Amino acid sequence: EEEIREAFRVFDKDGNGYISAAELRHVMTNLGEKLTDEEVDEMIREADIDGDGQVNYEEFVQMMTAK
């Protein structure tokens, strides 16, 4: 849907394909709830399921969607 994807398009402001923790916090800002840098690091954790040291779009799905 646009909600998830298109807002994700705004989320990736640069459209680089890759999400940083800092951008997680952006999405968090969009979400209303803004967590601090500390938590943003936890965003790497919760968002980084593949374990590459980065947050990607696939993982953006894997974080919310999960399994």
- Give the interface with Ca ion as residue ranges (CB under 5 A): 12, 16, 23, 48, 50, 52, 54, 56, 59
Burial of 3 (0-12, 13-18, 19+ CB in 10 A): exposed
Is 41 labelled a binding residue?
Answer: no
- Residue among 35 and 61 whose Cβ is closer to Ca ion: 61
Q: Taking Cα atoms as reference points, which of 30, 59, 61, 26 lies closest to residue 45?
A: 59
Q: How far is the CB of 48 from Ca ion (least distance, A)?
A: 5
| H or E stretch at 19 | strand 18-19
Annotated binding site for Ca(2+): 12, 14, 16, 18, 23, 48, 50, 52, 54, 59
